[PDB]
Every structure is written in C-alpha cells, then in structure tokens.
Amino acid sequence: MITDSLAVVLQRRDWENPGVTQLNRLAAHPPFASWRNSEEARTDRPSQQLRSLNGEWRFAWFPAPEAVPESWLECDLPEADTVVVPSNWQMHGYDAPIYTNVTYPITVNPPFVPTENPTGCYSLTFNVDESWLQEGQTRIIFDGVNSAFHLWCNGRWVGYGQDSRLPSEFDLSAFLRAGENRLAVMVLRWSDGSYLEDQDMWR
Amino acid sequence: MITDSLAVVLQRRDWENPGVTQLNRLAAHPPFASWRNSEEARTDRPSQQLRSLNGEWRFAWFPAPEAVPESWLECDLPEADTVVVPSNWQMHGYDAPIYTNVTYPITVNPPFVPTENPTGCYSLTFNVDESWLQEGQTRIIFDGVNSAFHLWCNGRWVGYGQDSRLPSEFDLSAFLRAGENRLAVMVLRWSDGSYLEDQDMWR
Ligand SMILES: [Mg+2]
Ligand SMILES: [Mg+2]
Numbered sequence: 001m002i003t004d005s006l007a008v009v010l011q012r013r014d015w016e017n018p019g020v021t022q023l024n025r026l027a028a029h030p031p032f033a034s035w036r037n038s039e040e041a042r043t044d045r046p047s048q049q050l051r052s053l054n055g056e057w058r059f060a061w062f063p064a065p066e067a068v069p070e071s072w073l074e075c076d077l078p079e080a081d082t083v084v085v086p087s088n089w090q091m092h093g094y095d096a097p098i099y100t101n102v103t104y105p106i107t108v109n110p111p112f113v114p115t116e117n118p119t120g121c122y123s124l125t126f127n128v129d130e131s132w133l134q135e136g137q138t139r140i141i142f143d144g145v146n147s148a149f150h151l152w153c154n155g156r157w158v159g160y161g162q163d164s165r166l167p168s169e170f171d172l173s174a175f176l177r178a179g180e181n182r183l184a185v186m187v188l189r190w191s192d193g194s195y196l197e198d199q200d201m202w203r
Numbered sequence: 204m205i206t207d208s209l210a211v212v213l214q215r216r217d218w219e220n221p222g223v224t225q226l227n228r229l230a231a232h233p234p235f236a237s238w239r240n241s242e243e244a245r246t247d248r249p250s251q252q253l254r255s256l257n258g259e260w261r262f263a264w265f266p267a268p269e270a271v272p273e274s275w276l277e278c279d280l281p282e283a284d285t286v287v288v289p290s291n292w293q294m295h296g297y298d299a300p301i302y303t304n305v306t307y308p309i310t311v312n313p314p315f316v317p318t319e320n321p322t323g324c325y326s327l328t329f330n331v332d333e334s335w336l337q338e339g340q341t342r343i344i345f346d347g348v349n350s351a352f353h354l355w356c357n358g359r360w361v362g363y364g365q366d367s368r369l370p371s372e373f374d375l376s377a378f379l380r381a382g383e384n385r386l387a388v389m390v391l392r393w394s395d396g397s398y399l400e401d402q403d404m405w406r
Contacts, residue, residue: 003214008206012226020223023215 004157006070013065014160015148015191018111021162026139026169053140053183058123059083061094064116065188073184074155076123086144089120095189101200110195117190124183128176139171140183147191152184162193207360209273216268217363218351218394221314224365229342229372256343256386261326262286264297267319268391276387277358279326289347292323298392304403313398320393327386331379342374343386350394355387365396 002008014020035047060080062068069077083092090097095118098105106114132138140151146164151157153175161168175181205211217223238250263283265271272280286295293300298321301308309317335341343354349367354360356378364371378384 002205003211008211011206017226019226023220023222 004073004152004155006068006073009150009157010065014162015188015193016111016113018192018195020160021193022168023160024170025159025161026171028166028169053124053126054085055124056082057085057087058125059089059092060121060123061089062119062121065119065186067116068119068121068186072121072123073152076125076182080121080123083122085122089118089187094118094120097202099200099202102198104195104198105203106190106194108195111192113190113192113194117188119189120187122183122185122187124185125180126183127180128178130178133173133176133178137171137173138176139169139173141167141169143167145187146189147194148188150186152186154181155184162191164193165197207276207355207358209271209276212353212360213268217365218391218396219314219316221395221398223363224396225371226363227373228362228364229374231369231372256327256329257288258327259285260288260290261328262292262295263324263326264292265322265324268322268389270319271322271324271389275324275326276355279328279385283324283326286325288325292321292390297321297323300405302403302405305401307398307401308406309393309397311398314395316393316395316397320391322392323390325386325388325390327388328383329386330383331381333381336376336379336381340374340376341379342372342376344370344372346370348390349392350397351391353389355389357384358387365394367396368400 014023033041033047034049035041036049040047058076058080059082060068060072060077083089088097089095128138140153140158142149142161144164144166145161145168148164149161151159151161151170153172154177156175158172158175159168159170161170217226236244236250237252238244239252243250261279261283262285263271263275263280286292291300292298331341343356343361345352345364347367347369348364348371351367352364354362354364354373356375357380359378361375361378362371362373364373
C-alpha cells in the first residue's frame with residue numbers, strides 16, 4: 001500500500017540529495033540503557049529493557065535499489081541467504097571491497113551517485129514481549145550503518161538514516177504488533193552522504 | 204500519476220517536519236537579471252530574458268491540505284475565483300487575518316501544526332516562447348511565499364519551499380512544453396518553519 005510501497009518511497013530519492021540526512025530519526029543521546037532498577041545502573045549489569053537484534057539475519061543482495069523486489073517488504077525472499085550481523089556484505093564476498101586512498105570510489109559528481117549502487121536488504125523477524133507494547137515507547141537502535149538505509153517495519157515504512165558512523169534511532173511503537181514482527185532494512189553502498197567522507201580505508 | 208499525485212506528495216508531509224526546509228530548490232544568488240547584451244546591464248534596462256508571472260492568478264481556497272482536490276493539478280477548478288498576485292489571501296477576505304504580539308497564533312507543539320491549516324492553491328497558465336525551451340535553463344522564481352508551498356508544473360511535482368521571506372528558485376526546464384503550460388502552486392498558512400518566526404505583525 002502506498003506510500004509504503006518501494007516505488008513511492010524510493011523516489012524522490014533521499015540519498016542522492018545532499019540536504020536530508022535522515023527522516024523520522026530521534027535526536028542523538030548518550031546511551032542510558034533504560035533500566036528501571038536503581039542498583040543495576042550503579043551495578044552496570046546488562047539491562048533487561050535493552051534488547052539486541054544482533055544474531056543471524058536474512059540477507060538479500062541487488063545491484064541497484066530499483067532492482068530489489070517491491071514484494072520483499074511484505075515477505076522475505078525465498079532465495080536470499082542468511083548472514084550474521086553486524087557484518088560487512090563485501091566481507092561476505094557478495095561484492096568485492098574497494099579501496100582508494102584519495103579518490104572517492106564512485107565518480108565525483110556531487111551530489112549525484114552512480115545509477116547502479118550495490119544494495120543489500122536485511123530482513124529480521126523477531127517477537128516482542130507483550131509487556132513492552134502496552135506501555136512506554138520502543139525505539140530500534142543501530143550502532144552503525146553504511147552508507148544510508150531505509151527502514152521498514154511490519155511492511156510499513158519507518159525512517160531514513162543518512163550517517164553510517166553515528167547511531168540512528170527510530171521509534172517502532174506504532175509499527176509493532178503482538179507476536180513476531182518482520183523487519184526490513186535496505187542499505188545502499190553509495191549515498192549523497194558518501195561525498196562527505198573520503199577518508200582512506202577499505203570501503 | 205504517482206508520485207505526482209497529491210496523496211503521495213503530501214505525506215510524508217514536509218511542513219510538519221523541522222528538518223527539511225525545501226526540496227529541489229536552487230541555491231540563492233544575488234539577482235543577475237540574465238541579460239545577454241552588455242549595454243543593458245550597464246544601462247540597467249529591464250531584461251528581455253527575465254519574465255514576470257505577476258498578473259491575474261487563478262485561486263482556490265481550502266480549509267485543509269487534505270481537503271484540496273487531487274484532480275485540480277491536472278486542471279483548474281471551475282468554482283475558484285481569480286485573484287491578483289502577489290496578494291495576501293486574508294487581505295482578499297477568504298480568511299480573517301490573525302495578529303499576536305508574542306504568541307504564535309497556532310497552538311505551540313513544535314514541530315507539529317494544527318491539523319486543519321488554511322490552504323490556498325494558485326494555478327497559473329502561461330505560454331513559454333519556443334526559443335527559451337530549445338536552449339538554456341529556465342527556473343521559476345518566487346520573491347516571497349508564506350509559510351510554505353508545494354510546486355507543481357504541467358501536472359508534475361517540481362519543488363518544496365520552506366522559507367516565506369527568502370526567494371526560492373526551481374528549474375522548470377524539464378517540465379515546460381511548447382504552448383501554454385499550467386502552473387499549480389499550493390500554499391499553507393502554517394508550516395513547521397512557522398515556529399521559527401514569532402515576530403509580531405499582522406499575519
Ligand atoms: Mg583523506
Ligand atoms: Mg517578538
């Protein structure tokens with residue numbers, strides 16, 4: 001259903017545009033860990049409230065963002081392999097890593113980016129405890145992403161994140177439903193933001 | 204045709220969001236007037252290249268942005284009156300002017316704005332000389348707009364502008380066609396940007 005559908009969401013494209021770093025992303029804060037017990041915070045014991053999406057992750061790879069199927073958001077593709085996260089897909093060998101000391105690997109036409117950009121979509125299915133849904137606000141957190149990603153929850157568009165190094169937080173409280181909730185994430189190797197960092201390291 | 208259609212374009216809404224001032228808007232520059240002749244620039248004689256969209260303008264008024272018809276972009280509404288531009292619609296008396304010295308007239312919940320915001324849509328039909336289309340780049344310019352507007356050319360979405368006081372330039376070269384071209388502009392009284400200016404003057 002539009003505008004949740006990929007074609008509407010993809011264009012106008014955000015990543016090509018210099019101006020919008022992210023859409024629907026909560027302001028950055030030092031991590032608190034959200035633990036109700038006073039002792040735990042002083043103790044520093046791992047918080048019950050905090051949850052990890054880390055684990056085996058469904059993965060799909062496409063040459064271009066246009067290429068990836070619209071249908072996927074509703075369901076994970078049958079073909080796609082499961083890849084551990086956090087991971088670098090190039091490390092997996094789906095795409096060869098590219099290293100350049102000074103030059104951006106992509107041709108330099110800011111803010112425009114190469115028409116075909118390797119895109120990997122990660123779909124995660126997890127179950128949220130009933131207690132969480134009833135009260136409070138639940139926000140997904142990504143420690144790092146590159147270059148830029150589009151976030152879909154339960155087949156519904158959630159957010160756009162423009163910076164790989166920084167953590168991005170989106171609120172899933174509306175999206176979440178009792179029982180398992182599918183998570184769909186789309187990552188593009190090359191972003192409008194990509195121009196900002198030309199630092200030389202394996203990319 | 205999506206995403207040109209109003210429902211897709213309207214949401215996600217830009218005006219509610221603090222972050223995006225504008226979409227597809229050319230960078231501000233001191234006016235040049237674009238005149239080929241050397242003498243004219245020294246002379247300061249009004250430029251042939253410069254064109255004025257000023258004149259009688261078709262006008263439509265709706266209580267909310269959702270309210271305004273999708274169909275209009277393709278064609279001007281039969282009912283709507285013709286109003287001189289530049290003009291303030293409240294001056295026309297469609298909507299009573301609201302004045303507040305300190306308080307924003309709208310309830311203060313940044314960045315969110317009142318669900319019904321008076322919206323006026325201006326449609327202008329003009330003919331572009333054939334010579335213009337063949338070579339060069341043609342960009343529409345607005346000296347001022349308030350609070351924020353969505354720009355459609357030839358039934359096709361062009362740009363979003365977030366600042367009323369500043370001039371906003373959009374490039375119409377792709378959109379323009381030989382013969383008359385319809386112009387559709389949508390203006391909203393209350394914008395996310397509205398919060399930025401609380402200066403006290405008749406609004
Ligand atoms: Mg360097
Ligand atoms: Mg004041």
